[PDB]
Structure formats: structure tokens, C-alpha cells
Amino acid sequence: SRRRVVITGMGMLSPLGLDVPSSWEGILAGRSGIAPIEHMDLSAYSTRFGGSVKGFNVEEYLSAKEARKLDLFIQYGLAASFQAVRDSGLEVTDANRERIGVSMGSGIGGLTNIENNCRSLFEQGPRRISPFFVPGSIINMVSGFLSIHLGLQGPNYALTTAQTTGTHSIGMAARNIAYGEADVMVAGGSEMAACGLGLGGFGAARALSTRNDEPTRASRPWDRDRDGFVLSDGSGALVLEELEHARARGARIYAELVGFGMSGDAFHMTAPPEDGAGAARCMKNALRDAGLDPRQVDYINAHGTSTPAGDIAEIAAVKSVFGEHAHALSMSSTKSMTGHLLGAAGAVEAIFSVLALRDQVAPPTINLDNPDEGCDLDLVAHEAKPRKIDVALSNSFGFGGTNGTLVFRRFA
Amino acid sequence: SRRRVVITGMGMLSPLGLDVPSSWEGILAGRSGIAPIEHMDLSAYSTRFGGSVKGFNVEEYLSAKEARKLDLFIQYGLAASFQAVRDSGLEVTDANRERIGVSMGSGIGGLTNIENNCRSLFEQGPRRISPFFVPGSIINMVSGFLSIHLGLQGPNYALTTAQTTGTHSIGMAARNIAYGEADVMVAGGSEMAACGLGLGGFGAARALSTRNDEPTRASRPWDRDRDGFVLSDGSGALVLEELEHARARGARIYAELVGFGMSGDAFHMTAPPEDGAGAARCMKNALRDAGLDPRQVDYINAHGTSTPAGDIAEIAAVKSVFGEHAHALSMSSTKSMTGHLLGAAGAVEAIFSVLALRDQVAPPTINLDNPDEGCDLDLVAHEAKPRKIDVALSNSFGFGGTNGTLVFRRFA
Numbered sequence: 175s176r177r178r179v180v181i182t183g184m185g186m187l188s189p190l191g192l193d194v195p196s197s198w199e200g201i202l203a204g205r206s207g208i209a210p211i212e213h214m215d216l217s218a219y220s221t222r223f224g225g226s227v228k229g230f231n232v233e234e235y236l237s238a239k240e241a242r243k244l245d246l247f248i249q250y251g252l253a254a255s256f257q258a259v260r261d262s263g264l265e266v267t268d269a270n271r272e273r274i275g276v277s278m279g280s281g282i283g284g285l286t287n288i289e290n291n292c293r294s295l296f297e298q299g300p301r302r303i304s305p306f307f308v309p310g311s312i313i314n315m316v317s318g319f320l321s322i323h324l325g326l327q328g329p330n331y332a333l334t335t336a337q338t339t340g341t342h343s344i345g346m347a348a349r350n351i352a353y354g355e356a357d358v359m360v361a362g363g364s365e366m367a368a369c370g371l372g373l374g375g376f377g378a379a380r381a382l383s384t385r386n387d388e389p390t391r392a393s394r395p396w397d398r399d400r401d402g403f404v405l406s407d408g409s410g411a412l413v414l415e416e417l418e419h420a421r422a423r424g425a426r427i428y429a430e431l432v433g434f435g436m437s438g439d440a441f442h443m444t445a446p447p448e449d450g451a452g453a454a455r456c457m458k459n460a461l462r463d464a465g466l467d468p469r470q471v472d473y474i475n476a477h478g479t480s481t482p483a484g485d486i487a488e489i490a491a492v493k494s495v496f497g498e499h500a501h502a503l504s505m506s507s508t509k510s511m512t513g514h515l516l517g518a519a520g521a522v523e524a525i526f527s528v529l530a531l532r533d534q535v536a537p538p539t540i541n542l543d544n545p546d547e548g549c550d551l552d553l554v555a556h557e558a559k560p561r562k563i564d565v566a567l568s569n570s571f572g573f574g575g576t577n578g579t580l581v582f583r584r585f586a
Numbered sequence: 587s588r589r590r591v592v593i594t595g596m597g598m599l600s601p602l603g604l605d606v607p608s609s610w611e612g613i614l615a616g617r618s619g620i621a622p623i624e625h626m627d628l629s630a631y632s633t634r635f636g637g638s639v640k641g642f643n644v645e646e647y648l649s650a651k652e653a654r655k656l657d658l659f660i661q662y663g664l665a666a667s668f669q670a671v672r673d674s675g676l677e678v679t680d681a682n683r684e685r686i687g688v689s690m691g692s693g694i695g696g697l698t699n700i701e702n703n704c705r706s707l708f709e710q711g712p713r714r715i716s717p718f719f720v721p722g723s724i725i726n727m728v729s730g731f732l733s734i735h736l737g738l739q740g741p742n743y744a745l746t747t748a749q750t751t752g753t754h755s756i757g758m759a760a761r762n763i764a765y766g767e768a769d770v771m772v773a774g775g776s777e778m779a780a781c782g783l784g785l786g787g788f789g790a791a792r793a794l795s796t797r798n799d800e801p802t803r804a805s806r807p808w809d810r811d812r813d814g815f816v817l818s819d820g821s822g823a824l825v826l827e828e829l830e831h832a833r834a835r836g837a838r839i840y841a842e843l844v845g846f847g848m849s850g851d852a853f854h855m856t857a858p859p860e861d862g863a864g865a866a867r868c869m870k871n872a873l874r875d876a877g878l879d880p881r882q883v884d885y886i887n888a889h890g891t892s893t894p895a896g897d898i899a900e901i902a903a904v905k906s907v908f909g910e911h912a913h914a915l916s917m918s919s920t921k922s923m924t925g926h927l928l929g930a931a932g933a934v935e936a937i938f939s940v941l942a943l944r945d946q947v948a949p950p951t952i953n954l955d956n957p958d959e960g961c962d963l964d965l966v967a968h969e970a971k972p973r974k975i976d977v978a979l980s981n982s983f984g985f986g987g988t989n990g991t992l993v994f995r996r997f998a
């Protein structure tokens with residue numbers, strides 16, 4: 175048998191806010207976090223906008239000295255992680271520290287740090303590379319530094335599954351608890367790839383919206399005028415906890431994590447198949463994992479990146495999985511507002527899925543002015559929709575055809 | 587309920603050979619794969635040698651047209667995975683493709699590729715970044731590309747836990763099979779961090795041996811004259827298989843994976859604790875997971891990186907875990923010959939640990955001329971030691987204080 179896993183703590187940096195409640199306020203108001211990128215000459219780039227974290231103050235979390243050693247993606251990961259642990263009320267002791275672990279991931283990791291040390295290397299040679307280059311850039315250092323700061327001796331690892339990282343991180347952390355490898359996990363992801371290499375690299379593949387005249391309208395999932403995703407920065411962290419452990423200490427429980435699904439498309443390196451067969455197997459895997467019938471699903475936080483082939487694939491996959499219930503559930507893309515946080519996308523979207531359960535509201539898909547051919551589901555166009563939500567899904571479909579689905583249910 | 591997991595296939599690129607048997611012959615004969623690096627000018631660097639993969643032909647596996655788009659770490663990952671799958675005898679069909687997944691990891695991933703595209707961005711501009719920069723560089727694309735070429739639709743993911751990556755990838759893939767998430771997994775890791783940023787960054791931290799005048803003698807685990815690790819490239823892949831699934835198809839079984847441990851040190855970003863307390867916790871978890879008396883352990887493939895603090899920490903951990911039996915078992919570091927493959931270290935060493943079981947021989951620790959203070963165990967100095975091996979343990983320890991132990995035993 176399996177132990178039940180609940181959410182007792184959440185943390186976030188997003189383009190909408192420096193914590194969960196500010197971010198969630200933005201989401202329910204349909205506000206965009208997308209804007210031209212500042213303090214960076216993007217003259218030579220086809221995309222000049224994205225979702226930046228605005229007014230982040232790392233000294234709320236770290237000494238200036240410890241922050242100087244760590245890539246922005248690590249700083250953002252630690253910020254969400256510290257918020258989430260604080261939010262949980264959890265007290266680490268010698269009696270429980272071996273039962274508390276971390277799985278914070280990233281899709282792309284330390285590009286900004288890699289960029290600046292490349293500058294040093296090419297200009298002045300290798301003796302100007304920072305001593306903290308490696309440990310300050312590698313993806314497992316959010317898990318590493320958090321475990322050191324809080325004395326966490328439980329399973330300590332990091333996933334990197336591109337745009338699926340946060341969803342897989344939360345899911346596999348839930349498995350650790352369910353099968354008794356840990357009582358508590360801090361799970362999620364962080365990302366900061368709005369450097370030249372990120373904007374340039376995605377730009378070279380012509381994957382990015384180039385709607386530079388109206389950045390806030392760039393991200394328009396399922397709209398006929400969409401022209402690729404918007405690159406965004408930030409982090410999500412959840413405190414995952416065994417139910418009896420949560421009840422014994424009187425924790426506030428936001429919701430229950432009931433289901434986790436994984437699948438591989440085995441199709442293309444960057445493009446999903448048109449019928450979304452892989453996303454369909456992954457959602458079916460997640461519902462079977464949760465012992466739920468597709469009919470019980472009320473809300474889906476779509477991957478919904480605003481790529482032509484991705485958006486249409488997800489519709490095909492929802493209609494395939496849900497049949498005559500596909501129109502009854504509400505499905506929205508909060509990427510319409512946040513843009514695509516890549517490896518942190520699944521983390522902040524799991525948090526939005528949990529908050530949809532708490533507040534009984536489907537977040538909007540903003541900019542959905544002209545649904546495309548066969549995009550005829552309840553996509554929650556323009557404005558938030560209060561409704562009954564007992565069961566919420568969060569999907570992530572990333573490069574390499576790697577898919578994740580989380581299933582959350584109301585707890586009472 | 588928890589299923590048993592066996593090894594039915596292995597594959598490798600190492601500094602000692604372009605497959606497993608050629609690499610293993612090198613291990614048993616005490617041959618070094620460490621040499622001055624030829625693929626770049628290192629005159630400005632304080633370390634000018636490492637374990638290069640010699641004479642690698644990507645056209646044994648992939649079209650030149652596809653290989654051109656991929657970092658060497660992905661090429662090396664695919665080579666090893668392809669070897670392991672062929673070696674397994676497994677045939678992928680519509681009946682089983684949903685039950686076969688892949689977990690191939692990396693510590694750093696496509697650093698060469700990111701550096702070269704960084705040079706294009708800085709010298710010319712963003713218009714010269716390869717359209718293949720992202721899918722050709724990010725860590726999850728070994729798993730991605732492998733699933734696309736073989737049609738693997740099972741769990742598809744990648745770990746990045748620095749020098750522990752290979753051990754964690756193999757352990758967590760076993761858990762997937764153990765718990766019914768898959769019946770087959772291709773798991774391990776790949777690394778190619780020998781670019782300017784890699785040799786420069788580890789150099790900046792003064793973590794590397796600078797024995798440039800005698801590179802084959804640089805890697806000297808537990809030797810009093812050791813001065814840091816030797817940086818090495820390559821890949822290890824194993825096919826992990828549910829036992830009854832293996833029995834049902836008449837698979838050749840190399841050995842059984844009976845134990846997996848993880849722990850965090852929660853000590854330091856980069857230094858291990860002198861007492862090996864996190865390594866001891868990790869091995870004890872692994873031995874309890876295997877249902878073993880620690881006196882059943884015959885052979886340990888140590889992390890044994892040839893750092894002053896790392897090597898002594900391991901002795902202390904082994905003495906704390908095994909007490910008087912610490913004097914009866916054999917422990918060696920194959921990093922004495924291969925150098926440190928970082929994220930691939932745990933993958934190649936898991937394979938050496940299985941071959942130690944097949945051939946009943948402890949590989950040597952070469953260059954152990956003057957064992958250091960307290961390094962008084964059977965460290966198999968100089969020469970391979972034929973001996974009874976029923977149970978073999980493989981340890982990895984990484985930046986972030988992240989620990990992994992694998993336990994293998996002979997299968998009857």
C-alpha cells in the first residue's frame with residue numbers, strides 16, 4: 175500500500191509577484207507580467223520582451239556574500255523554498271531531519287553565470303573564472319544549499335526535464351513520501367534564462383513570440399494569432415508532507431496530491447505529435463494512479479505555451495482522455511499571464527492548481543480573442559470563472575517528448 | 587508490492603575503451619586512461635590533462651547529420667544506452683513500449699556547446715546562435731533522443747546531482763521498476779566537461795590535480811601525495827529489468843540490484859565532512875534497503891576521487907558502517923585509472939561493480955604507493971585481487987552534500 179501526501183506550504187517568485195498571494199491576485203485579475211526586458215541591449219534579438227521577476231531582494235534570504243556565489247536561478251529557487259518551508263510552519267529537529275529531503279530542479283540552469291564567466295574566459299583567459307563557478311551554476315545546488323541551510327538529511331536530488339522539470343520534481347517527491355523514503359519534501363523548480371543565450375537560443379529555433387509591439391498580448395494560448403511562447407523567470411516550491419505527519423503537528427493542508435503521471439511521446443525533439451497521444455497516456459496514467467475516473471476532473475491547468483502545434487495537441491489529448499466530459503471541465507493556461515517559466519512552469523502551475531481548489535475559481539486564459547480551429551472547449555477566455563472544483567490536473571509537456579501530470583483533490 | 591530488479595544489459599565509453607569489455611580489460615590490467623588533452627590549447631590552464639574518450643566514432647550509432655546537432659555528452663549517452671539495449675537482447679514492441687523508460691543524467695551537460703554558442707554570441711551576435719543550441723545542450727535530451735530512436739514511451743527523465751548523478755539515476759530507475767511504474771529502464775549518465783569553462787572552473791576552485799608532468803600518476807586515491815581529482819569524460823548505461831519480466835524472456839542476468847541509499851550531508855556546498863557522517867547514513871540506508879548484514883559486503887567501489895578530504899571521509903564512513911568487517915572486505919577506486927567522470931562516474935562504476943561480481947575480482951587502486959594516515963584497509967593497491975564477491979557496493983558523493991549507494995549481489 176501507499177501513504178497519502180498533502181500540500182502544507184507553498185512559495186513562489188513569478189513575473190506577477192514576489193510571493194504566492196501577490197502572484198495569485200495577478201492571475202485572478204488577468205494581469206500580464208510580460209514587458210520589454212531591461213538593463214540588457216536586445217537590439218540584435220528578434221524577441222525583446224519576457225516575464226522578469228521585478229524587485230527581487232535576495233538579502234531577505236541570503237547575506238550579500240552567499241548571494242554573490244549563486245546564479246539567479248539558484249537564488250530564485252532558494253527564495254521559493256524558504257517561503258514554502260516558512261508557510262508550512264514545519265520545525266526541523268534531530269528527531270525528523272533524516273525524514274526531510276529536497277527535489278528542486280531547473281530546465282536550463284546557470285546560463286547567466288555561464289555567460290559572465292565566458293566573458294572573463296574569452297577576454298582575460300581562465301584565471302579570471304570565479305572559484306564558485308561550478309557549485310554556483312549546477313542545477314542540484316538549490317537542493318544542496320537548502321539542505322545545508324535547514325539541516326535537511328533526507329533524499330537530496332534535482333530533476334532536469336526541460337519544461338516538465340517542476341511537475342516531475344513535485345511528482346517524484348510525492349513518490350518518496352508515499353513509499354516511506356521521506357515524511358516531508360520541498361519540491362519544485364526555478365529558472366532564469368532571460369539572458370542572451372536563452373532569448374538567443376530559443377530565438378534561433380524561432381520558438382518565441384516576436385510580438386515586440388505588444389508584449390502583454392504575445393502569450394495567447396489557443397488564439398489563431400499566437401506565434402510561439404514567451405520566456406519567463408521565477409520559481410515554485412511546495413512543502414509535500416505525509417498526511418498523518420501533517421495532522422499530528424496541526425498543519426494547515428491546502429490540498430491532497432492524489433495522482434502523478436509520466437509518459438514519453440517518443441516522437442520529436444521539440445514538437446509534440448498532432449493528436450497529443452503522449453499527453454493523453456500521461457493524463458490517463460495520472461488518473462489511474464489517483465484511482466479516479468476522467469469524469470471526476472473539474473479543472474486542468476494546461477501546459478498551454480502559445481505554440482501553434484503544442485496548444486492544438488493538448489486539445490486533441492483532452493478530448494481523447496475525457497470524451498463526453500471534455501466540455502464540462504474548465505481548462506486554462508496561466509502562461510497567458512506569466513509566460514513560460516520552463517523548468518519552474520510546473521511548480522508555479524501546481525501552486526495555481528492548488529489555489530484553484532482553495533478558492534473554487536478557474537484562472538483565465540487571457541488574450542483568447544479568436545479561438546483556433548477545434549479549440550471549442552471551456553478555455554476560460556478573458557476572465558476568472560468561479561465554479562465547483564473537487565479535482566484539478568496540472569500538465570507539463572517538454573522537449574524530448576517528456577510529459578508529466580499532477581492530480582490534486584480538495585482535502586477535508 | 588515491491589518487485590525485484592536485475593541488470594540484463596550494460597554499455598560504456600570511458601578513457602579506457604569504446605565499450606564495456608575493452609574498458610574492463612583496462613581496469614583489471616591497472617592501465618591509466620589519463621593523458622595530456624589534445625582537443626584544445628591548455629597552455630594558460632593549471633591542469634592540461636584528463637581522461638578523454640579516445641577514437642570515439644559517433645557514426646557507429648548515428649548519422650553525421652544528427653550527431654552534428656548534439657553535444658558530445660549526448661553523443662556519449664546515446665552510444666552507451668544503444669550498447670546497453672543491444673547487449674540486453676530486449677526487443678521494443680507495441681505490447682511493451684509503454685513499460686520501458688529512460689533516466690540518463692549529467693552533472694553539467696552541454697558545456698562545450700554552450701561555450702561555443704557563447705563565443706558566437708559575444709564575437710558576432712545572437713543571429714549566429716545554432717537553432718539546435720537548446721535541444722542539443724540541455725541534460726534531459728539523452729533520455730529524449732533515446733526514447734525517439736528506440737520508441738520508449740515509459741517514464742522519461744534525467745537527474746542532475748553533480749558527481750552522484752549516475753548512482754542516483756540507476757537507483758531511482760530501479761525504484762520505478764520496483765514500484766510498478768515501468769518493467770524496463772535504461773539508466774546511468776554521461777559527461778564531457780573538458781572545455782575551457784570546465785577545466786577553468788574546476789581549476790579556479792583548485793579542485794584538480796596539477797601533476798601535468800606525470801598525468802597517469804595524478805589520480806592516487808588515499809595516497810599521501812594526492813592533490814585533487816582528474817577530470818574525465820564518458821558514459822555508462824545499464825538496462826534495469828523487473829525479475830519475472832527478465833525470466834519470462836530468458837534474459838541473461840548479470841546481477842541483482844538489491845539496495846539503494848540516498849542522504850544529504852547538510853554540511854558544505856563542496857567539502858565532505860571529515861567523519862564521513864552522510865556517507866555512513868547513505869550506506870546504512872542502502873544495506874537496510876537490501877535486507878543485509880553489513881558483514882555480507884565483500885567489495886566496495888569507492889567514490890575515491892583523490893582529494894585530501896574526500897578520500898579520508900570515505901575511510902571513516904566505511905569504518906563506522908562496517909566496524910571490524912571493514913578490515914575483511916576489499917575497497918578500491920577505479921578513478922585511480924579512469925579519473926573522475928563526474929555525473930557518469932556512478933554509471934561506469936556501477937558497471938565495474940557488476941563485472942567484479944561476474945568475474946569474482948576486485949579491481950586495483952593504482953598509484954597507491956604510500957597510503958595516507960588511517961587508510962589501513964584492503965584498498966587493493968597496484969594489482970587486481972581475485973576473491974569471493976557475493977555483495978558489491980558502489981558509492982558516490984557530490985557537491986550539495988548529496989550521497990548515493992547502490993548494492994548489487996550475484997543472481998542464482
Ligand SMILES: C[C@H]1CCO[C@@H]1C(=O)Nc1cnns1
Pocket residue numbers: 604605646647668669672
Ligand atoms: C561494442 C559496441 C560498440 C561497437 O559495437 C557495439 C555496439 O553495441 N554497437 C552499436 C551500434 N548501435 N547500437 S549498439
